[PDB]
Structure formats: structure tokens, C-alpha cells
Design a protein around this ligand. Structure first.
Ligand SMILES: [Cl-]
Ligand SMILES: [Cl-]
Ligand SMILES: [Cl-]
Ligand SMILES: [Cl-]
Ligand SMILES: [Cl-]
Lengths: 311, 311, 311, 311, 311
């Protein structure tokens, strides 16, 4: 079959609608999310019009093979969506009402810089390539754009499911293409992060600061180096909870700073020992006494600078 | 083919039944479980009515392509189920008895707050979208709802397989949808958790408490800090056994508390040393002597409080 | 097509045979294994009988679509098997010789209680659902049940591939079902376990026992606690080699006991130190001297008890 | 259908063009990447020529089955691409404008020697096997070779998507094969590697150098050995970040050198102690004093040498 | 279609060839390797013979559906190969020249005993099952057996791609089967193994040996135990590089021996301390002095013995 012919020289409008049934498998590393939804399509084909009085039925139901259907594809999918045509409905004027249920793995880039206080906009881009006989343009029927109340993505608050009504019409491979941006807005449930990541990580670092109320070089070497091991071990433990970003994140910056602090605490411990050994105990004692306040203060400050620097 | 026509204006009743053959791959992280079951369907399609005497046969057998079959889908599946029609049997009144064997990856949210003493209700939601000519309504034939005795989910006790008889009939995208809730009830086999997770984790903590019968600051630093490392390594070891919950679980609150205890034990060890060093050995000794009882008591109390809050 | 009609009132006998070509992907955690095998089927359909003289042929070859074929399925598969009909052959009496090559992922429960001295019986359950016109019964042709010599499952000795001749005939959803139990017997190759798991684990534990020839509390704390870390580190290293059982295994009991031993060794080390410190060195010395024999003896006794309980 | 016949003795030219829609799953270990793109094909088939006046059409649209289409394959794919013919258009002269959307997993060797300062050229090799009647030759239409602006590969800067215009025409299995090299140029985003990999790794090594301002053999053994553990623990933490190269990398050579440094630091610590114990404290002190400069200077010198060898 | 009829009573010869296009995904654990190649087939079908003169063609080209093609399968594949018929060409005598491009996941057992100095022979077994009318026998056309020069398997040197010309003709499921052994010979690239695995592992063990130049029991306990932890940590670190063998490998024998050495070093350290403490310092000193030579010598000797036993 060929596309419906234009009355004048106008493009064909395909009214689209996505209704989210299920959201699952948000892969932080792959930057992909699996989605199960309805895709509704509507357009006028006058070749399929009929006088309801002459005809035999109000609405004529067709098989996909029987009539012309626009080839709608998704831009940001790994492979083509798995679709199952639920219904095709032709009214007396030739207004086609298409409906399919599809599942797809959608590639949408993620920004982990504010982890775990991040929010994401997941995109589903609808596209239609224009044909030889006439141009095809996508449109949004907002009555057919929604999401099931039960839609969930463990660890996230599902904010909204909307579409940018104005399509992106552009040329590609010598033909017009009309694109639609459907947006799923999600924000992370950051609470567990405090008792799970930050708090135990801070306790380890705080244990290293006890070296400031000790003069035993052996006990101090043990405190600093053994906590450093505990820190790395704890990091190994929480690897999984942190996302795949091969770029600097807020949490990643706190963590880097904590590594610097272990190194500085070693310097202090080393300095204090050398001074004592090299018969300068008054300096050694004044440095250790200062560090007791200097360490928490410089830490707490650098964290406000970090927080501010990120938010 | 079109749906069977109504005699008056009545909806079509599709009598459903699911019989569980196999239950497998319960993914605590994905919140998905895989299923292999029979799906039985029964409706009346008078266009198929026959005379047993002319036909010879008491029951007619058809291929799925030959007759109209209702489009039943599952709401909470990853992709459409893999189905194989086992049998289609038409009696002369036009009553169709459909049967298929299907496998599906079902998405059902899980609540790990009580892990490992958690129980779950797994849902399989059956759905049918009504058509232009007539409304379709789902029903439950309880004689056809069951599960194979051999059905297992390693680590769980399979309690029951039932269906909420009353369907959820509602409107969606300008058409009626009739939904059925099939429930698989499971409860976790928590025993192994004691010798596997808790007991070795408690022994490590108890070793740290021996610092309360020691005055050697070096030996105490080694006890606390090395046990803390042992705890983190033990935690990495049991990572897998613990579920994916990005929220606070019961097992999780105990693990957080154990981290707090290591920090408090460090404070004590540090305090006791400073007092001794700052010529106050009587206080140092009274604090250590108190700690011996304080630590187990406060621990035992806080664990009772936790259990109470979670259960 | 309909099933062949009964001469009297007899059920139809389908003679089955499975010949294992390949066995791969034994997943200890999923309790699943993948299989590539031939499935042979045999029955008599007198409607297919021919006079070889008129036909000029001794044997007629058919396409699966052309004739009636019994619907054989497997009970314990994740999804339906991938099959390719190799041959369909008909002899003048109406005897059908069916053959297909199939691959399938089979779910079979495993018992890890005796690991690594465990043996497993893998099950492949063949099934046929009876029809309205006649009952269908499965049978085993043992000449037709075999396995390729090259069939392997790394880490296991493939003992036998057989079938329990007597089918399990039972009623399900108001129809007869004839089931066949095909068994693949495997026994674990436990040798590598000694140099890979037990021996290094025992050496670490034996190092902690040297604390019984030392009076240095600091050296003893280091011996017991550092070996405990080494043990946990070693467990982590061997995680993979140990299976997924969420229940107590033989190796699992030994490992738990080894954790108890580290705790007891700490108690001793702590006790010996307190007694010394609290001016009772004779008791401290007698406890340490006893421990030297008590520890290996109680260990060796407890292991004999465990072995006995498990075997 | 047979290929279009030659007017003289000329080969058939198939003008190709790949337009990258999506790029995902760059697997550093597998040396594979996934791609979603348009494949455009152009050729003149005079048998398809038509008079637009008689036909009433300016352009004829065909189904792939209806006309002859060249069999284009990709050399370096895991399995054959998943393709969906978007459009086939014929103009009155017999020009065929083919277009398909395809997804494919591409195998392209990677060179990790300069990690994380490495750049890669990804290859997608297009191929056509010539037929009995005429030779088929591939060509590149550069206007039709592009990539979507949104194309990303997390951790990489996507430099260019081009094709080596000159095809590689060669004989294989007694027939001509015309090959096209499509190149996707990528360069690694190395910044995060400094705060993530190198800096914490260098701090650990620097802590070991403090043993050169200490005479306590016990404190020194703790410094060197505990940092060695921390280093190994740190590598385990960053295993994932480093690529799969089973050959020597730049990062890899630095890491090996750091292991040598821990060994040398042990020798020093051991030597200094033996001399001190064997009543030669002046030598012990001069060795330690030298080490303070020798260690950083030699490390710095060797890194300069390494950088030079790799760049 | 039926197979070509025999002139006398002779079997049909199918001349085979495999030309390796791609070699990828060699999975050491699964013992599977992925292949992408051409499969060439040639056989005589006199029903297809023609006179070039009254036909006008030198060669006739057919569609797979038009003529009879032998059903060639692979024995050791997980699922059936993905094939795409490239060309079918009949010469005047009736000789068919078939060609397809296929990809397949081949199961071939691997022997890791000599790792990393191990070589492997990967098998691709071609098979044809004989038919009712005539027997089918496989043959090797060596002109059509090859591999692309660019064929690679990261970490291996691709030695050769050959076929054992003489087929293995045998009976299976009451019918003749003709098998062909195609061999891909690979040998491992063992270089980084030295700087990556062995060298850092030997440095850790050498650090432990420093305890033979020390009399401090505390320093010695720290040296032996902390290096033991570092060793285990290093193992956890190199797990990935070592293959899946659940049997004793060459590298694995060295590793086991290294565990024994840590245990022996502990015994020495313990013995030396007891003797000193029990007023026998001359024996303690002579044992430690001996150990200094005994340890490296016994190590170097048993390594020579092991190498000899494995090679
Ligand atoms: Cl799509
Ligand atoms: Cl479904
Ligand atoms: Cl099956
Ligand atoms: Cl391809
Ligand atoms: Cl195959």
C-alpha cells in the first residue's frame, strides 16, 4: 500500500500517544532503561472512508497487513521495539485509530555529578521518515499520554511522564524526519546513603584523628595506616552502590578528599615523630595540638566548599 | 476474525485459570521472577456451533489461526510471554476451551525491610482490552487455578497460589480493561542466616570488646582497628547474601549499629589512654570497668529495640 | 489433524528416546543446566498405512504439518525447547519414526549438603497431555536412550544417562498426563578442593594456634586477629568455588566451626593475659599449656563428628 | 532475480553510506561495540527503468523481495546485523535508492598500551561478493556518511565518523570481494583517572617512604607491609577501571614499578636494621639518609623514562 | 525435494570447506568460542545438468527453496548456527556450488594444566545424517579450507586452521552419520604473566624471608602474617587472569607451594622464639641462619621439580 494522498500539498499528521504500563531495569552503567507501554497512532486516510448508512458497521476493524500504517520508529533504542498490535479502528471519515503494546530497551544518557542527590530526565524519541508522495509530521494527543500509577523504578521517585508537543522536524538522508521527545522524570531516593556510605566512611576517618592524642609513633602508624586499609576495604564494599560514572561526582570528590586526609595525617604523624626524635618536643606537641582542631575544621570547611561547588 | 457477536448487549466473559508448573529465577535485585505455567481460557463463540450428529464428533479441535481468540496479556511482564497452544476444544454450543503453556519474566515489587524474616506476595496481573463491537470481561475458574507440588524457589517456602476472583474493570485510553490479580505467596527460609551472617559478625564485634580487659594502648588499637577491618572484610564476604534494597532493612540497621559500636570502642580506647597519660588512672580504670558491662548491655538493649521497631 | 483412532479402547503409546549430544552450563546457583539432544518419537497411525507395491516406495517421508504428531513437552524447562525436526518416516503399517534435534535449559534441584563429595541426579521430565478422542501414554525405548561419549560437565564425572521406564500417569485440569523421568547422574571431582580450599584454610587456623607458645599479648593479638583477617580474605578468594546453597553444607559447617575457633583462641589469649596481669601466672601458664593439645584435639574430634553426621 | 546486465564489461557500482544513529556497549575486554545506524545503498538497474508518462508515477516503490538487491554484509560482526528496510525507491532511469536501519555488534581490535591517554579507531568493514554474471564494486558517498550529534560512548570523546573511499578489491574462494573501511575515531577522557587511580596510588607509595625518617624496625615493617596491603587492596578496588589488555600497558608498567618499590623499601628497612643490630649504625644511618633522596629521584627518573618509551 | 538418485548404489559425496572470517569470544570458563565463517558445500545432482548451448548460460543460479540441499549441522554447537546463503551455482554437469556465511558458539573442552604456557586445539565438528533413499558422506576440499589473515583471539597466537580429511562414518539413531573434524590451533601469549602475576607474588614471599635476619618475635609475626594477608589479597586481585579449571594447573601448584612456605616460615618464626625463650639461643640462631639459605634453595629446587613434572 501507498500513503494516503494529500487533498492540496499538506503533510500527513500522525497523532501519537505513549501510555507507560511498566518501567524496569534502569542500568546506571549502560545508561539504559527498559520500558513496557502502549503506542497510540492516529491519522486520516480518505481511501478508508465509508458512508455508515450504506456500509454495514459504524467502525471498520482492520488487520495491519490490510491497510497503510506509518512506519514509526524510536531513535534511542538498542534494537527495534517488540510490538503487538492491540487494535486498528477506522471511523466513517477514514480516521485510523491504531494501538500497539510494545517493550523496548531505551538508551538515555545519565548525569551522576550530584549523586546521590541527582535527578534524571529519561528520553524516548519518536520518529517518522517522510515518503516520496507526501511528508509525514508527528503530533501529540495529550489525552493518550500517561502512565500507570503502579509504575516504579526502585531507588527513584517517578516525578512525571510528558511529551514536548512541538516536534523536531529536520532533514536526514535526503528526506524529512519528524521527531517527538517523550520525557520520564525521576529523582533519586538518597536516604539510605547516609547510614550506608557516608557515616561509616566518616567514622573510619575520625578514628585516624585519634593519632592527635597520642605520642606513640607505633600506635599512630597503626591508627593511620590500618584506617587507610579499612577505608579502601569499605570503598570496595560500597563500589556497587556508587554509579558507573568515569567522571568526577560529588561523592567521588568527598572520597578523593578523604584519601588526601589520610596522606596529610601520615605527614603529621611522621613530622611529630621526627621533631621529637630530633630533640624538638615543643614543636612536635604544638603541631599535634593544632591538628586536633585543624583536621576537623579544614575537613568541615572543604566539604562546604565542595557542597556549594556542586549545588 | 472479529469477536463473537452479542445476542443482546452483554459483555463477553473469558473464564481464566493459571496452573503453575515451574517457579524459578527470583531476582531480589531486579524484583522479577520467572514462571512456567498453563493458561486456560474459556468463552462462547456461537459462530463455531456444530451438530455432533452431522460432524460425527462430540468436540471439534481447531488451530489458533482458524478461530477468534481473546487477546489476553499480562500487565507486569518484561516482554510478552512465550506461549505454546496445547489445545483448542469446541463443544457444540460453541463453548471454546483454550489451553496454552507459557513462560514469562514477571515484575513484582518486593519489600526487604524485614530481611531475612520477610514474606512476599508475587503478582501476575491478567488483562483484556475490550473491542469496538463488544466488551470483554475476565472471570476466575477456581477448578483451573493451582500449582504443581514440586514448585520451588530455593531459599523460600511456597505458601499459596490463588486469584482474587473479582476482576478490576476500569477505563483506559477510551476503552474498558478487565484485570485479574493472581497471587503467589512466599516466605523466606531464614535459618542459614544465623551461622552464615550474624554469628561470625557478632564474634568479630565480641573480640573488639576484649580491649576492656587491657591497658596496653598498642594492643587495644590493634584489637579495635583490626576487628573493624575484619568486620568490613566479612561484610564484603556476605554482600551477595544481603538483598538489593536501596532503603533501610532490619539486617541493615544491625550492620549500621555494629559500625557505630566500633567507633564508640575506639573513643573508649582513646579516652582511657588520654586519662592514663594525663595522670588520671583511676578514671581511666573506672571507664574501662564500666564499658565491660555497658557495651554488651547497650548492644543487647538496642537490638531488642530494633527488633521491636521492625516487628 | 486429529489423533489416530483406537482399534478397541486402548491408549496411544508414544515410544520415546533422548540421546544427549552436548551438556553445558551447569549453574550451581540457578540449579539449571543446558542440554543439546535428539528426541526420538514413535507411534502407529493406521490412517497412514500404505501398500508398498502401488506406492512404489518402501518408506514415505512427511513434513510435520502434513501428519498428526503428539505434542510432547518438557516439564522442568525455563522456556519451550528449540527444536529442529531432523526426520519423519512412515512404513507400510502406518508406523511413524519421528526425530528432532533440540536445545533446552533444564531446571533440576540440587543438594549441596555433601559438597565437595556430592553426587547429583539431573532430571528431564517428558510429558504428553491426552486428548478428547484418546488417551496418550509415553514409553521408553532404552536402545534409543544414550549419550555421546564426548559429553562433559567440567568438575564432574558423568556417570549415566537413563530413564525410569514406568511413566507417571496422572490427571491434571480434567485430562490424563503421562510423564517420563530421564536421569543424568553426575558425581563431583573433589580432588582440587584439598590444595585449593581446605589445606590453605587449615594452615591459617594452625598459625593462630602458635599463640599457645607465646606470652606476648601484643604478638598474640596480632596472631589471632591477623589470621582471622587472612581467613576472611581467603574465604572471599574461594567464594566462587563454594556453591549457592542457602542451607547448611558439610564445607559450610567446617567453615562456621573455624570462625568459632578464632573466637575461642581470642578468649584464651584474653584469659591468659588477664590472669598474668592479675598476678595469677600459674593458671595463665596451665591454660596455655592445655590449649596446645585441647585446640587440635577438640578440632579433630569435632571434624570426625561432622563427617559422621554428613556421611 | 539475477543482477542487472553490463552495458559493456563494467562492474556494478554500489554507492554506500552509513549514518550512525546510536553507539553503545564499548566492551574494552571483548574488543566489541554495538551500533545502530542507517545503511544506504545506490545502484542503477535498467531493467527497472520506466516511462513516467505512461506509468503516471514519478517514482516507483518496491518490496525487497520484488527486485534484485546486492547482498551487502559486514566482515567484523558477531552475528549478521538486524535490519529493517526503511525504503526502496526507483526513478524512471532504473536508479535504486535503498535504505535500511540496522543494529550490529562489531568486533574491532583495541590498543591499550597508552591507557588512559589512548585513542582508538573503530572499524566497520562493508563487503560485497561478486556474482557469476558480473562483478560488484562498493563506493562511498561521503554526503551520506555521518553520525547523529547525540552519539556518545561514556568515557570517550567521539572525534569522527568517516570511510576510506578507496575500496579493498580482492579475490576470495575464487570470486571478487569489494571491501569498505568505515572508521569511528574515539579518544579517552583521561581526567578522572588522576583523582581516581594515580593520586591515591601515589599517596600509598609515599607513606612507605616515611620509613626513611624512622629507626623503629617494628614501625618500619608496619609502614612498608601495611602500605603494600593497602596498595593491593586499592588495585582490587580499581580493577574494573583498568582495561583487559593481556600485554604491558603504560599504567600497567607504573603499577609493576610500584610493586618493585615496595620490595626495595623492604630491603632498605631490612638492611638498615641488620647493620644497626650488627653494630654498624653509621652505615645504617647513611643508607637511610640516602634513601630519602634516592627513592623519589629514582621513581621520578624512571617515570620520565616510562612516559618517554610509551609516548 | 528428494535427494539426487544414485547411478548405481554409491553414497553422495558432499565436499565441504570452512573459511574463518572472525574468531571471537573465547570463554575460558564456559569452554566455548564464537566463530564467524563461510561454509562451502559441493555435490552432484544430475537432475540439474544442462547443455550450455540450448540454455545460453555457462552457470545456473538457484534459490535454496528451488533445489535439494544437504542438511549439514555442527555437533558441538550450543544452538544451531545463524546462516545466510550467499550463493548457489550449478555447472553444466550438474555440480552444485553452495556457499553460506554463518556464526556459531562452539563448545570445545580446554586443558589449562600448563597455564600460561598452554596450547589448545579447538574443534568444529561437521555432520550429515544420511537419508532413506541414499547415504551421504562428507569430504574436504582443501582449496576451500582457510582463514582471514586478520583473525585474532586476544591473548593467543592463532597457529593454524585445518581439517582431518578422513571423515568419521558411524551409525546413530538407526541411520549413517558422516563427521568432519575442523581444527583451530591456538597457543597462549604468556608475557605480561611475569610482571602481572608471578613477580609481585614472589616479592611478597621474599619480604616474608626477611624474618630470617630478625630476632624480634613481634616484628617477625608482623612480617609473616601481614605478607600472608598481602599474598591472599594479591590472589583475590589476580583471580580473573587465572582460568576456570577446577583442577590442578602449573601456576596453581606454585600458588599452593607459596601457601605451604608461609606456613613453614611461621613454624620457623615460632620455633626460633620458643628456643630463645626456653634458654637455648644457640639453636634458635643456627636454625634462623640455616633458613636464610634453606628457604630460597628448597623453593628454587621444588620450582625446578614442578616445571619438570608439568613440562
Ligand atoms: Cl522501534
Ligand atoms: Cl503477555
Ligand atoms: Cl519443551
Ligand atoms: Cl551483516
Ligand atoms: Cl548447526
Amino acid at each position: 500500500v501507498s500513503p494516503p494522498p494529500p487533498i492540496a500539498d499538506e503533510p500527513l499528521t500522525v497523532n501519537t500517544g505513549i501510555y507507560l504500563i511498566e518501567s524496569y531495569s534502569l542500568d546506571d552503567c549502560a545508561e539504559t532503561f527498559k520500558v513496557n507501554a502502549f503506542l497510540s497512532l492516529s491519522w486520516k486516510d480518505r481511501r478508508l472512508a465509508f458512508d455508515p448508512v450504506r456500509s454495514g458497521v459504524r467502525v471498520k476493524t482492520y488487520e495491519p497487513e490490510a491497510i497503510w500504517i506509518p512506519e514509526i520508529r524510536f531513535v534511542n533504542v538498542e534494537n527495534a521495539r517488540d510490538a503487538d498490535v492491540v487494535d486498528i479502528s477506522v471511523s466513517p471519515d477514514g480516521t485510523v485509530q491504531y494501538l500497539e503494546r510494545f517493550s523496548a530497551r531505551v538508551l538515555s544518557p545519565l548525569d551522576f555529578r550530584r549523586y546521590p542527590f541527582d535527578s534524571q530526565t529519561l528520553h524516548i524519541y519518536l520518529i517518522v521518515r517522510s515518503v516520496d508522495t507526501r511528508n509525514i509530521v508527528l503530533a501529540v494527543d495529550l489525552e493518550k499520554v500517561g502512565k500507570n500509577d503502579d509504575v516504579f523504578l526502585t531507588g527513584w521517585d517517578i516525578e512525571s511522564f510528558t511529551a514536548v508537543v512541538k516536534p523536531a522536524n529536520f532533514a536526514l538522508e535526503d528526506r524529512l524526519e519528524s521527531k517527538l521527545d517523550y520525557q520520564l522524570r525521576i529523582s533519586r531516593q538518597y536516604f539510605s546513603y547516609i547510614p550506608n556510605i557516608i557515616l561509616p566512611m566518616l567514622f573510619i576517618l575520625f578514628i585516624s584523628w585519634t593519632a592527635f592524642w597520642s605520642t606513640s609513633y607505633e600506635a599512630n602508624v597503626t591508627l593511620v595506616v590500618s584506617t587507610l586499609i579499612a577505608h579502601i576495604a569499605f570503598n570496595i564494599l560500597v563500589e556497587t552502590n556508587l554509579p558507573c560514572t568515569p567522571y568526577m561526582t560529588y561523592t567521588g570528590a568527598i572520597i578523593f578528599m578523604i584519601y588526601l586526609f589520610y596522606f596529610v595525617a601520615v605527614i603529621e604523624v611522621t613530622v611529630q615523630h621526627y621533631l621529637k626524635v630530633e630533640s624538638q618536643p615543643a614543636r612536635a606537641a604544638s603541631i599535634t595540638r593544632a591538628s586536633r582542631i585543624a583536621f576537623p575544621v579544614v575537613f568541615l570547611l572543604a566539604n562546604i566548599i565542595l557542597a556549594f561547588l556542586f549545588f
